[PDB]
Design a protein around this ligand. Structure first.
Ligand SMILES: [Ca+2]
Ligand SMILES: [Ca+2]
Ligand SMILES: [Ca+2]
Length: 187
């Protein structure tokens, strides 16, 4: 079973990042909102390259998510279904397996949404630009970024971002850096 700490990390991500219209379930309509929000944030032209690519990528991610979590096949993922899926995913990451492919795709999507300069590094300004748009206070973006980059000793490359992303979802260690990947947690 997920510890309180894991369960709460996994709920907080459902609630802030996936359920964009905040009604308590994840559907395709949420991903339609997530596309609008990222288009607004970055000033992408509707039906331009980035927009059409974001839509295609998120379709694949939603499809893999529903496949894993949508037990009653109603095209909606409730918190119950999301927690049931996560308890099984975490067990498996511990037994040695990679996270599900919809989750890695979503990690790579969010990496590139952050890295608007395209140099393979998320810098402090890129990071706070994205997380502040989800309601993360700026001081929790800046404190998170220093934690994640080990105060500048580590560049937040796609690979670092991917390893921190797995740690956020599975770690039971309160000390883990990836706990703060989505804004500092007070622990
Ligand atoms: Ca929703
Ligand atoms: Ca369902
Ligand atoms: Ca960059």
């Amino acid at each position: 079973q997920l510890s309180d700490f894991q369960r709460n990390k996994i709920l907080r991500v459902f609630n802030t990042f996936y359920d964009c219209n905040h009604d308590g379930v994840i559907e395709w309509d949420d991903f339609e909102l997530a596309i609008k929000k990222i288009c607004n944030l970055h000033s992408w032209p509707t039906d331009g390259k980035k927009h059409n690519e974001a839509r295609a990528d998120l379709k694949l991610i939603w499809d893999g998510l529903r496949k894993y979590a949508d037990e009653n096949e109603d095209e909606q993922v409730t918190k119950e279904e999301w927690l049931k899926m996560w308890a099984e995913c975490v067990k498996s990451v511990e037994k040695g397996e990679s996270l599900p492919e919809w989750l890695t795709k979503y990690m790579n999507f969010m990496f590139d949404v952050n890295d608007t300069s395209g140099d393979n590094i998320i810098d402090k300004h890129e990071y706070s630009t994205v997380y502040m748009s989800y309601g993360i206070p700026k001081s929790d973006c800046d404190a998170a970024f220093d934690t994640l980059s080990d105060g500048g000793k580590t560049m937040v490359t796609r690979e670092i971002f991917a390893r921190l992303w797995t740690e956020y979802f599975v770690s039971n260690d309160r000390g883990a850096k990836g706990n703060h990947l989505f804004g500092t947690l007070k622990l």
